[PDB]
Amino acid sequence: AVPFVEDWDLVQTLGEGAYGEVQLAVNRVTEEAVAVKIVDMKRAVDCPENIKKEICINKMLNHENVVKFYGHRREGNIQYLFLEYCSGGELFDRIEPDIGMPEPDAQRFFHQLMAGVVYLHGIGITHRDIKPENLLLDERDNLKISDFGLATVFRYNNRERLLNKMCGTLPYVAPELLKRREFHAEPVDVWSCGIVLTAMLAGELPWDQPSDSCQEYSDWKEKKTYLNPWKKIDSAPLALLHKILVENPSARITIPDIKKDRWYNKPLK
Ligand SMILES: COc1ccc(Cl)cc1NC(=O)Nc1cncc(O[C@@H](C)CN(C)C)n1
Three-class secondary structure assignment of 65-119: CECCEEEEEEECCEEEEEEECCCCEEHHHHCECCCECCHHHHHHHHHHHHHHHHH
CATH class of 97-269: mainly alpha
For the chain, give every residue range classified as CATH 3.30.200.20. 1-96
Q: At what angle do helices 185-200 and 103-122 cross, to 10 degrees?
A: 170
Q: Which amino acid appears at position 227 of this protein?
A: L
> CATH code for 1-96?
3.30.200.20
Q: How far is residue 247's CA from residue 243's CA, in Å, rounded to a whole number?
A: 10
This structure's resolution (Å) is 2.6
Among the options 40, 98, 129, 219, which is catalytic? Answer: 129
**Alpha helices (H) along 90-214:** 103-122, 176-179, 185-200
177 alpha carbon to ligand 1 midpoint, in Å?
A: 27
Within a 10 A sphere around the Cβ of 46, how many other Cβ atoms?
Answer: 10
**CA 67 – ligand 1 centroid, Å:** 9
Which part of the chain is CATH 1.10.510.10? 97-269
Ligand 1 atom at shortest distance from the alpha carbon of 83: 15
Please provide residue 6's backbone torsions phi and psi, each rounded to the nearest 5 degrees.
-95, 0
Ligand 1: residues with CB < 6 A are 14-15, 19, 22, 35, 37, 67, 83-87, 89-90, 133-134, 136, 146-147
Query: Among candidates 151, 152, 142, which has minimal Cα distance to 65?
Result: 142
Say how far apart CA 258 and CA 27 lie, in whole Å.
Answer: 41
Amino acid at 16: E
Pairing outcome for strands 89-90 and 159-160: unpaired
Mutate to test the pocket of ligand 1, among 24, 69, 136, 144 (most ligand atoms within 8 A of CB): 136
For this structure, is 129 an active site residue?
Answer: yes
- Burial code (b: 16+ CB inside 10 Å, e: under 16) for 164-178 equals eeebbbeebbbbbbe
Task: Give strand ranges (E) for the chain.
Answer: 8-17, 20-27, 33-39, 69-75, 78-84, 89-90, 125-126, 135-137, 143-145, 152-153, 155-156, 159-160
